[PDB]
Amino acid sequence: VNSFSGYLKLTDNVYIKNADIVEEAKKVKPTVVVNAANVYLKHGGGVAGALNKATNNAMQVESDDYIATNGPLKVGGSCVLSGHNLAKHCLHVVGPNVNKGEDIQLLKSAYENFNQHEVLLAPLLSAGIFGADPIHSLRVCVDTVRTNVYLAVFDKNLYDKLVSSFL
Numbered sequence: 001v002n003s004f005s006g007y008l009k010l011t012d013n014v015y016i017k018n019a020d021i022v023e024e025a026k027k028v029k030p031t032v033v034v035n036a037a038n039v040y041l042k043h044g045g046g047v048a049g050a051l052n053k054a055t056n057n058a059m060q061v062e063s064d065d066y067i068a069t070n071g072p073l074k075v076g077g078s079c080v081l082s083g084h085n086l087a088k089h090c091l092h093v094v095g096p097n098v099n100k101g102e103d104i105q106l107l108k109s110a111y112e113n114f115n116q117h118e119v120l121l122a123p124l125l126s127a128g129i130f131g132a133d134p135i136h137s138l139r140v141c142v143d144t145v146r147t148n149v150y151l152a153v154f155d156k157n158l159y160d161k162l163v164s165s166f167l
């Protein structure tokens with residue numbers, strides 16, 4: 001049994017809810033929240049900008065030190081950093097950004113990072129300002145992630161379309 005409330009069950013392991021991931025993290029304090037990161041961990045906008053704002057920029061400060069030591073992530077890659085006030089850990093995952101022309105086949109690689117964690121609160125990778133089709137992102141998630149994933153979808157309209165169209 002876990003803390004997550006109000007989710008619709010899509011599969012054995014994937015759950016979905018219309019929710020602000022920031023407000024959901026603040027309530028649940030999950031072991032892992034996933035950030036929709038870029039390779040530079042520059043948390044300017046979208047989910048990343050919202051998570052970082054909720055940490056009062058501490059996520060960005062920590063991320064800048066990580067990049068200064070390790071260099072950029074790979075598209076499809078990830079790193080584990082602090083969850084600050086939102087979670088124990090933040091798994092920063094880089095999905096391909098279609099608005100940069102990145103290979104959408106890297107979306108499966110991005111979701112494979114979730115399998116290193118038994119339970120996660122996450123957004124749909126490559127959705128929103130990363131430009132991919134969220135319906136496609138949900139399908140890759142279901143077909144890739146085997147651990148227990150609780151997906152937060154900010155937009156109610158999109159939430160209803162994802163559920164109605166789910167096979």
Ligand SMILES: Cc1ccc2cc(C(=O)O)[nH]c2c1
Nearest residue numbers: 005006007017018019020156
């Ligand atoms: C967006 C949203 C807001 C409130 C709730 C409450 C639930 C629940 O108890 O099932 N789900 C929600 C989804």
